[PDB]
Amino acid sequence: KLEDEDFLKLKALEFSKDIVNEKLQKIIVVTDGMKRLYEYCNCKNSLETLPSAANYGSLLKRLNLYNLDHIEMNVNFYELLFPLTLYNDNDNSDKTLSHQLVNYIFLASNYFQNCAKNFNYMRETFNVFGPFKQIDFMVMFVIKFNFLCDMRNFAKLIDELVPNKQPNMRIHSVLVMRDKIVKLAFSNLQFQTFSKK
Amino acid sequence: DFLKLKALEFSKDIVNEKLQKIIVVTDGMKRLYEYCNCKNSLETLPSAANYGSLLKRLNLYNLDHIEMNVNFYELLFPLTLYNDNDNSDKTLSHQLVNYIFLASNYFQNCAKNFNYMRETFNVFGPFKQIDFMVMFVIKFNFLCDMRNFAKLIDELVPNKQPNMRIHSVLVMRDKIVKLAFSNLQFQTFSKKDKSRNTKHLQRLIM
Amino acid sequence: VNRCIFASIYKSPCSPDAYHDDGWFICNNHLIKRFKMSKMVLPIFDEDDNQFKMTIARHLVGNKERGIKRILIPSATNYQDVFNLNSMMQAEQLIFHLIYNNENAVNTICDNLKYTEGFTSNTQRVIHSVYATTKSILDTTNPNTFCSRVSRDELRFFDVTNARALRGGAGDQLFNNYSGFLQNLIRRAVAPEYLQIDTEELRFRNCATCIIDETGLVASVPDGPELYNPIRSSDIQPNRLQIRNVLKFEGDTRELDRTLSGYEEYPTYVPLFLGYQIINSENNF
Amino acid sequence: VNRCIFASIVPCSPDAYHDDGWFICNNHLIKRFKMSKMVLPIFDEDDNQFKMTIARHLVGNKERGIKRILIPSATNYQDVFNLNSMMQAEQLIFHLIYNNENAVNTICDNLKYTEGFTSNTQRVIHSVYATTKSILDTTNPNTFCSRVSRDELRFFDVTNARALRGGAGDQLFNNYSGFLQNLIRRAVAPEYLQIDTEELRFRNCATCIIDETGLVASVPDGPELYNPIRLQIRNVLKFEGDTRELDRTLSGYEEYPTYVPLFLGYQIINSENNFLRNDFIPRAN
Amino acid sequence: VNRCIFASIVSFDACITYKSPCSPDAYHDDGWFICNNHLIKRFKMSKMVLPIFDEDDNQFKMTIARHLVGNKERGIKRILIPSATNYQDVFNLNSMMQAEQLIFHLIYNNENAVNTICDNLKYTEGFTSNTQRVIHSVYATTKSILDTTNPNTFCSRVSRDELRFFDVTNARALRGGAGDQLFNNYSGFLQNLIRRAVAPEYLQIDTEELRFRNCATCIIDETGLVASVPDGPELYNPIRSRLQIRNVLKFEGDTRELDRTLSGYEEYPTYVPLFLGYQIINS
Ligand SMILES: [Zn+2]
Ligand SMILES: [Zn+2]
Ligand SMILES: [Zn+2]
């Protein structure tokens, strides 16, 4: 079924290519060291904490080659999803996807809430899964990874639609009022007297 | 070269970093890193006249790569966690906290008044991505000034133990910082399909 | 004075509170008659300023009842025979056809009345004045109209994050297509499970109370057996035998209640919640 | 005769003068575990009246960490019962309850070290001691001529009940101190009842958990529900618009309180419905 | 004798009569030609007096005003006065009564629309009535105020010797900029009233330069006046004489009788003053 998922990703690629009209290329991508991007199966993505993500404990090797360690990584759900709001009105006379999008956003919010609540002990379970204390950092990446795969799945569902000129302000309002508390949640992440670490 | 030789020597000498490293203070990056040479100011908004050549360089480069948020807590918190003993520790703590407040107020004003800034910059920089350019350039100007401040204040500073007072002030500032971000209207209008549109999430993996 | 649709119309023991300014447009008497629900209140507050004495409602469905019996409020789908309007008075049938937008039936009714002497001579005034009065309710509901006087500073959601349900969401289409006064009644009956506030968000119940389906509103928990609920049975044919089984446990020594009654007791009843509500931090304007 | 476990102290609320298996004044239940002695109306109104013991959950919403603990385990008891904040008698009482013989004897020697003991107040103190000890003595189910429960069982999980499965909370309770076990059984209404005739489910969500540290106020999922309870900040939050006046209709409507009940575990009744004996029994499985 | 412009305004019809008229201050001679009532009702300001020393208790005094805008509002709300660019949208004139709109368009010299409405009214019975006379009397008042002095003698002397720099106190406040240069643009009535309303932060005389505040309370504006700080968060403006959240995380404050102890001590006021740049004076 991997081949099927590849095929459907290619179909989303075709959609993207057809909708986009201009490359505007050769503007230098100085920032990006896009070395060897790779993906893993999105199954089980509705929930989290499984050692299936730990299964590739070999990731320490690629980390040592090219760490990209980011302490205390935080997320701007607004900045991510905002472009995608301009689609429901391409077709008309239904919440053809927005009826789903709204609750999907709320579910993502609650996911963030719950994983924030839970990680504080799941550290130890992930150390059980692999004793490398460095895991304690490397865990966090998976927290995003999971929803990254969620978005990657969702992209297959709705790629028929192209930016509306002017969004429903209700969507923006929701995005703001949720994301504010979302980002606030990170505040409570803290450190306690590690001495000369 | 003294800007290196003052403190990068200690940075290389230390082999003891266990929680968080000084990832870059005089390190890495390439030709983009070199434009910063004037004594930038945190006291006031940047002087648009000083950066036009940087704008003309930026015209060649894509800026959407970098997230809006400063990471005001994330990046800075670790870079303060060390000290001497009580002698002049008052000087250290107080001057730090004052620099903190300065940075705070800087960002605040930036947020409040960005409109005027981007507009005025675009006046002479009629570039299609001028908004992203000014956006980033704020960041980078700040970062360069802060880098120079780091080179100046770099010290023996071996002792390490958290000061709950400092961390309390930290959280108190940063929460409102993020709140200011949130208050930003974040390009809500004008369709902003002029953007790269998040590269459609290029190839589903980027 | 009454706003009850039945009071608009023999005797109706209409609830006196239907005369008292709360636009349910129906007595609890008739909420029983046709739907077996009770209107109720939930005061909420920080400092017992008690700004938020929100209305709510509960059902009285029997826990062992299944199928149509669990449908709290039918969709237009099959509503004709879910209600069995054919058994009902022509006034009732007309009212329900108005609610369900059955203008075809309205026409048929008016045609059948046309040649009847009881329509020509008299009662045309009754029919059309009652119709106008009823339509006034629509004109006082339906935010698309009524001076947009429904807005009322807050925005409601129902199909929100149905626990482990799959990625999706539906039925608000039918919700909107139902007469807006029905939707207002739904807002009155079912408080949101969560509220957004200018500053913050708040939660009221852990687990879901009810579901809306294409068939209509249906009382179910998400999972497992339905929570036990005896009917209150305080209130309501002999032309034919009527029968019911019931399981009774016939306790004794209850006078120990001499001791037990001295201590406080907790409700055992059926609040209904669904979805979010939101107070806008800032007007869109 | 009063039999609050704190009536030994040398004030209890008047209810403590009655016999109850709480063995506590409501005053002390408030002051230490923040909860009210209550019952529940298991009153199917068709002349089928019953009640069950409860204490409504009331500990605050914003609590964190150890604050979440409503009652600590012996493994963590003093972290909440910071004895330095607590009087010697209280400390000794908790030591006994946790079978802390070491602390018991330590306090016994502290009696001597308190040179003021020469006034022979030790005699009264030890009398009070024995008075308190009486209660544990009476409640010990293991005593050879204690009467085990007929027909009755309780477990801390639906599946552990139905299939006799082992599990965390069950084993914790089994290892747990006998008197406090009994107090738990007194307080905690089940999520479920198995009668051979029928299984009754009372909620699809089950309040807050028990863990090795103690009773934890954490819901399984999502944020906590609201709890409407000198150099300190009152931090008051207040809201506008007062209340529009419908108060007659409001008082005519049914009033739910905001109280948080207990719904944890699974009960079983088997081979006969015969519970309504009203003598005290330790009532072990 | 009465001279408030709003007192001069009269209703076109018996309904919407000008009840709640100008207060007695309309009769008074501050030379602002506006009751403080209407100053509130249209601009969210209250006039005040600054006493001044002639180097002495010997009387010197100058008029001032406080703004009434709250700390939390932004944009249009903060705009105290429009430009001719935007007055139309700021006022929503069609909300306002036709005579009001008339007067405003006269103030902005929108003669096109003004006389268009006049030409429509000509043969209307209500305008064959003396409303025309009313309007031309207000025109004569304008002549007697402006052509006599405001863009004339007053403009002349302001452009001859005793200018005020309505200018940024410190050039780093580039958000202010040379917007003083825009002062040239407005109708002389408005320019005069602005000058009368706003104090400088400084005065130069042969007796010294006098500093009346450390830091400017205001900023110059892109169209018309806008209440805003030159720098930082807006300073708290209190306000004096609905399904809203009104949390106030107050300190518990059990120290009762505070004022019964303290009331002798000076009860320092809070309302925002108005400062801008430098005035210059010779004797
Ligand atoms: Zn009625
Ligand atoms: Zn007691
Ligand atoms: Zn006036």
Report whether C151 contacts C143 (CB < 8 A): yes
Q: How far apart are the CA of C175 and the nearest CA of chain A, in angstroms?
A: 12
Size (chain A), residues: 197
* Interface probe, candidates A113, A158, A173, chain C, greatest C C-beta count within 10 A: A173
Residue D52: burial class (beta carbons within 10 Å; 0-12, 13-18, 19+): buried
Q: How far apart are CA E200 and CA B192, in angstroms?
A: 43
Chains that touch A (3 or more CB pairs under 8 A): B, C, D
Report whether A184 contacts A107 (CB < 8 A): no
Q: How far apart are CA C182 and CA E178, in angstroms?
A: 61
Determination technique for this PDB entry? cryo-EM
Q: How far apart are CA D6 and CA D128, in angstroms?
A: 10
Residues in D touching A110 (Cβ below 8 Å):
222
In the structure, ligand 3 is a single-atom ion and the residues with CB under 5 Å from it are E 4, 6, 22, 35, 38
Q: Is D102 on the interface with E (CB under 8 A)?
A: no
Which of D230, D237, D240 lies nearest to residue E252, judging by beta carbons? D230
Distances (CA, A) of D115 to D53, D102, D125, D126: 46, 21, 15, 17
Category of C224 on φ-ψ map: left (φ > 0), alpha (ψ -120 to 50) or beta: left
Q: Given strand D210-211, what is the order of strands in its sheet? A: D69-72, D214-216, D210-211
Q: Number of helices (H) and strands (E) in chain A: give both, helices first.
A: 6, 0
Please report where in the chains the tokens 């579910």 appear, as a residue: A107
First to last CA, chain E: 34
Among candidates B136, B118, B116, which has minimal Cα distance to B127? B118
Question: In angstroms, what is the C-alpha Rg of chain A?
Answer: 19
Please report where in the chains the tokens 């106030």 appear, as a residue: E248
* Interface probe, candidates C188, C228, C257, chain D, greatest D C-beta count within 10 A: C228
- Residues of A in CB contact (< 8 Å) with D are 110, 113-114
Q: How far is the CA of C38 from the centre of ligand 1 (A)?
A: 13
First to last CA, chain A: 46
Query: Is D239 close to E248, i.e. CB distance below 8 A?
Result: no
Considering every ligand atom shown, identify the ligand nearest to the alpha carbon of residue E42 and give its number: 3
Distances (CA, A) of B33 to A35, A103, B62: 21, 44, 15
Residues in A touching B60 (Cβ below 8 Å):
27-28
- 3-state class of D267 per DSSP? strand
HEC profile of chain E: CCCCHHHHCCCCCCCCCCCCCCCHHHHCCCCCCCCHHHHHHHHCEEEEEEEEECCCCCEEEEEEEEECCCCCCCHHHCECCCCCCCHHHHHCHHHCCHHHHHHHHHHCCCHHHHHHHHHHHCCCHHHHHHHHHHHHHHHHHHHHHHHCCHHHHHHHHHCCCCCEECCCCCCCCCCCCCHHHHHHHCCHHHHHHHHHHCECCEEECCCCEEECCCCCCCCCCCCCCECCCCCCCCCCCCCCCCCCECCCCCECCCCCCHHHHHCCCCCCCCCCCCECCEEECCC
The C-alpha torsion from C118 through C120 and C121 to C125, rounded to 10°, is 90
Q: How far apart are CA D130 and CA E125, in angstroms?
A: 106
- Residue D14 is classified by DSSP as G
Chains that touch C (3 or more CB pairs under 8 A): A, D, E
Q: How far apart are the CA of E159 and the nearest CA of chain D, in angstroms?
A: 53
Residues in D touching E245 (Cβ below 8 Å):
237, 239-240
| Residue D38, strand partner residues | C264, D54
HEC profile of chain C: CCCCHHHHCCCCCCCHHHHCCCCCCCCHHHHHHHHCEEEEEECCCCCCCCCCCEEEEEECCCCCCCHHHHEEEECCCCHHHHHCHHHCCHHHHHHHHHHCCCHHHHHHHHHHHHCCHHHHCCCHHHHHHHHHHHHHHHHCCCCCCHHHCCCCCEEECCCCCCCCCCCCCCCHHHHHHCCHHHHHHHHHHCECCEEECCCCEEECCCCCCCEEECCEEECCCCCCCCCCCCCCCCCCCCCCCCCCCCCCCCCCCHHHHHHHCCCEECCCCCCCECCEEEECCCCCC
Q: How far is the CA of C5 from the centre of ligand 1 (A)?
A: 7
Residue C40: burial class (beta carbons within 10 Å; 0-12, 13-18, 19+): buried
Distances (CA, A) of E270 to E202, E235, E237, E239, E275: 21, 10, 8, 10, 15
Q: How far is the CA of D177 from the centre of ligand 2 (A)?
A: 20
Q: What would the two tokens of residue C270 be?
A: 């059926």
Q: Is D237 on the interface with C (CB under 8 A)?
A: yes
CB pairs under 8 A between D and E: 38
Q: How far apart are CA E182 and CA E225, in angstroms?
A: 11
Query: Is D201 close to C225, i.e. CB distance below 8 A?
Result: yes
Residues in A touching D63 (Cβ below 8 Å):
none
Among candidates E85, E64, E83, which has minimal Cα distance to E198? E64
Which of A12, A13, A83 lies nearest to residue B198, judging by beta carbons? A83
First to last CA, chain C: 38
Residues in B touching E172 (Cβ below 8 Å):
43-44
HEC profile of D182-210: HHHHHHCCCCEEEECCCEEECCCCCCCCE
**Residues of C (266-285) whose Cβ lies below 8 Å from E:** 279
Q: Kindly tell me whether chain C and chain A come into contact, counting contact as 3+ Cβ pairs under 8 Å.
A: yes
Resolution for this PDB entry, in angstroms: 4.7
In the structure, ligand 1 is a single-atom ion and the residues with CB under 5 Å from it are C 4, 6-7, 14, 27
Q: How far apart are CA A184 and CA B178, in angstroms?
A: 8
Considering every ligand atom shown, identify the ligand nearest to the alpha carbon of residue D14 and give its number: 2
Distances (CA, A) of D271 to B91, D276, E162: 80, 15, 107
